[PDB]
């Protein structure tokens, strides 16, 4: 609880779309190596032997993402063999868990400088490719009453009273703020364009974005998790636990849910001595982290107790946080989070979110963390809180302070 952990760099690739995406031809190992080489470009005299570990989140560590992709990135990029490399999977919060684990490894005093982030090429390795101890075990699947994240989001909208127009209004809000952030140049220094082995450009923007989105177009979209609940019977299973609810209002579509995209993110985290030894300017400080959870089946109410726990841990309140960043897995989860904690609208996902730019599962946590490092510096604000809902029913939150 002694060594303060600092963020020195936080970069990410652009997010390529699922259908006819620009990054579909790019191996997820190449997405990480490109970010490693960018860190070298910004700090050429850095002694990489001081880097003691590389922690990458990855929700589907199979195929191109199997065999400890973090260690593969270490060996492929020519980093020292002493730099380790570990893959971890905590569903949607894997990217932020890698950052938090790196920060906690620094706080323990037994690691000095760590790379953290995530990688997910969902166009090459789709969600569910890794099978699953739950889905292959009907005896347990039957008992825990497994219900996909999507039905829980519709259930949250049903319970909280969020209409189809309410969630589509937030989706339009995310598209507008993501376009304003790209036009204003907020992402110019942290989105590292992907290039091939000849230096040719592959992708330099978040191509899932639809900046010309309208209230009228969103209302025409069909609810996307309606045939999932009918053919799978997940509606009836959800209402067996939530027996006071009669019918689930299916409001979520492809336009108000997170996008299926490819991408990676890297964060350099180390102690103050590590920054001074290598001449690195600290950009922010990891104030506190927290892991919690809430009701399963609903699956997505986990970020509420995790935020209160990280605020209680840092001795802060909602009023002390300048920027709130919650992953836009589904619009109703953000609206529930905003309603529970009374988050001011001007502070919540101010540069857009996964509805506009995409949700590359294993990398999203580190992407939205780096987004808040940039926005605190741009606004000259002080504190930001970053959190993500998780599958199974858990949550992860992190507080950072600009330095």
């Amino acid at each position: 609880m002694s060594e303060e952990a600092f963020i020195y760099e936080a970069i990410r690739t652009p997010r390529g779309k699922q259908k006819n995406g620009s990054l579909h031809e790019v191996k997820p190992l190449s997405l990480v190596v490109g970010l490693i080489d960018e860190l070298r470009k910004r700090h050429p005299d850095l002694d990489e032997n001081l880097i003691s570990d590389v922690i990458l989140g990855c929700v589907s560590p199979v195929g191109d993402q199997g065999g400890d992709i973090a260690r593969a990135a270490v060996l492929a990029s020519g980093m020292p063999v002493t730099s380790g490399g570990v893959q971890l999977n905590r569903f949607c919060a894997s990217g932020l868990e890698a950052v938090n684990t790196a920060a906690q490894k620094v706080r323990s005093g037994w690691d000095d400088l760590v790379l953290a982030g995530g990688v997910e090429s969902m166009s090459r390795v789709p969600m569910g490719s890794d099978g699953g101890a739950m889905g292959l075990d009907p005896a347990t699947n039957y008992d825990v009453m497994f219900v996909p994240q999507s039905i829980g989001a519709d259930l949250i909208a049903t319970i909280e009273g969020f209409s189809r127009e309410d969630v589509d209004a937030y989706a339009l809000r995310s598209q507008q703020k993501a376009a304003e952030a790209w036009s204003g140049g907020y992402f110019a220094k942290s989105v590292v364009p992907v290039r091939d082995q000849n230096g040719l450009l592959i992708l330099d923007h978040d191509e899932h974005m639809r900046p010309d989105t309208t209230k009228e177009g969103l209302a025409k979209l069909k609810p996307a998790f309606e045939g999932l609940a009918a053919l799978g019977g997940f509606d009836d299973v959800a209402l067996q636990k939530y027996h006071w609810v009669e019918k689930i209002n299916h409001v979520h579509t492809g336009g108000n849910s997170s996008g299926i995209v490819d991408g990676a993110a890297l964060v350099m985290i180390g102690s103050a001595a590590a920054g001074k030894l290598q001449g690195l300017t600290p950009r922010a400080r990891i104030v506190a982290t927290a892991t919690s959870g809430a009701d399963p089946v609903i699956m997505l109410t986990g970020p509420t107790p995790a935020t209160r726990k990280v605020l209680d841990r840092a001795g802060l309140t909602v009023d002390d946080i300048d920027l709130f960043e919650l992953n836009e897995a589904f619009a109703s989860v953000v609206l529930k989070f905003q309603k529970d904690l009374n988050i001011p609208d001007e502070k919540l996902n101010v540069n857009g979110g996964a509805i506009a730019m995409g949700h590359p599962l294993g990398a999203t946590g580190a992407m939205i963390l780096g987004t808040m490092v940039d926005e605190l510096e741009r606004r000259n604000a002080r504190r930001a809180l970053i959190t993500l809902c998780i599958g199974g029913g858990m949550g992860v939150a992190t507080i950072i302070e600009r330095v």
Partner: protein, 729 residues
Amino acid sequence: SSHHHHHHSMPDNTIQWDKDADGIVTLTMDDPSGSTNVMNEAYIESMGKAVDRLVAEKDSITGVVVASAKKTFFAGGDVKTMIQARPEDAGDVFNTVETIKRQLRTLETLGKPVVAAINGAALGGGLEIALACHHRIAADVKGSQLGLPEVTLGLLPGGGGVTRTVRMFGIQNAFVSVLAQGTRFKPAKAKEIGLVDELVATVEELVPAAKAWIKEELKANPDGAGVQPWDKKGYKMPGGTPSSPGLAAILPSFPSNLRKQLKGAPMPAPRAILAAAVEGAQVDFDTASRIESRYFASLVTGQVAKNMMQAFFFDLQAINAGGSRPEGIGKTPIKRIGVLGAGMMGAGIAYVSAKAGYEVVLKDVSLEAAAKGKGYSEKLEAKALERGRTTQERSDALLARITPTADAADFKGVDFVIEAVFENQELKHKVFGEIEDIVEPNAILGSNTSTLPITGLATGVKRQEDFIGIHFFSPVDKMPLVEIIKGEKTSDEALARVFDYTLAIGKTPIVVNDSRGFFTSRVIGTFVNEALAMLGEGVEPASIEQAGSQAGYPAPPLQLSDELNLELMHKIAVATRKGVEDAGGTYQPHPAEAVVEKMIELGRSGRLKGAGFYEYADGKRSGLWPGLRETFKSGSSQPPLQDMIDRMLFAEALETQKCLDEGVLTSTADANIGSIMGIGFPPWTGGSAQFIVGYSGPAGTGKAAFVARARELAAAYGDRFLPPESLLS
């Protein structure tokens, strides 16, 4: 390792051995202790002796034929053994089915063809024996059935049925079509789905056709003779294994779909079958078979299987043997039936009576109404043609026995009357007065009645000896119970004639002594009133309906209350208030009566009047009434779901005990089967009486645990849950 049930330190012999000059061994199963081959201790030792001999003489054996000398092939097991297996006997249960399957596995990997000569019914272990053979031939004879129905008893096919049907058909088709519901198949449909390979017309052709197939198989396929598909190098499971990408995408939806079908009811057998099926498809055949044994031991030593086995093998069999039928009476064949009333009840009674073979005269006030009553049978037969069950010939003869009329003279020559008009004593008096002299002098005077005592109805006819209550349940074509009510002047011969009529139309009878509400209507009243009480207390209606479905009922209680009509529930409470205040006392009003009157006051008295607890549009149910939550302030009371479930189950169980105390019922067999088939008491309980002796909660098991839980409900919800003295000491 052994084929035998004992390897230290004496059963009989049930299998005859015969080896022809061609080396084909015919095993003929002929258990001397009964008319049916059964998986008893004698069979296990007999098959073990035969399989040992098959291995010892393998150099002189070219093929095997498994046959039966009974009217059936093989059906069932020794139930007294399974029902007594305690949790501490799980090791012996596990070892027993492992020994059973070790015999079939050796028979299956003998290196030579084995053919099943299925002469009759092959049920449960009987089909499992056949599935261990390499080729199955069935004799398409009437009465023959093939299937694995052990899930209906709370068990699973632990002799290889799960493992082999999954290898044959894949996980999804084997579970849905064969295992989950234990579907029985006629020989023709069994061959269509691949459960059987060939058909023959008569049983005499079976053994010759089997040996002919063995001869051709050895000549045409000598490399793969006696080798099942799953024992070859390139075996590919239909629909794929759980690791295959196509099936791995939908496999997480299988438990949720099962939970949807069961509506959350606590039936562990389908859950165990799905687990054994999927887990078995992940490993080799022998490992899959051992997993199947472990899940089978979980069900046998469990309480639910003991409830279900008690209801079928002991209660239902005692009823079908004549347990409630009086002793001395003989037969009295029935020539012509007279149904009074052409509503959904009378038209349904006319359908099940004509389908069994009887001539039926269907009377109403007008021919227009009686014709629409026969139209109920026409539209049931129109769907039976399109689905292909009945033929075009038999359907026209079925409808031809229904004679719609309005003239009372057409009851000329009727020896069995079934009245089914409005629930009104003075109306029933008149309708029988207009009809008792036109009918035969020996005719049964039956009355379909829900609550009105039969003794009072009989005072409106001359021969009260032949007056009796014959209570049917809507819709009559699908509901299987007939509640026979014995009036005070009803003769023993009238009971036996209606008892035989119930069996003739393919329904199950119970005999009930005359009383208000009888058994079914009185007990189901405590079920609906318990839910209306919860609604008045402030419990959410959606939670009440979920509690009804997750308890295992076929219809949630508010949905059922809209179909029984609240005006009828009102005047039953008014009639019972006269049954006390006329005798000179005070009435104890059920708290549900205040909810019934508030709904009648609001003009929402059920489905008939267009609105009740649910909204109705275009003749179909359209969700709960939105104003229902404001009327009763729903959400103010939030008891746990298990309290709502227990309140409904305990109300009926306690009311069933009262009926046994008062003498309304004369056997617990009638109470269990009557509650299951009559009012839809959940099958997993084994009956509303078995619910007491076989109760299982977090506090304990048995009658003492039922009493303890009933006292928790009484302290928290009212004295109606206090147990009667008959359950105490």
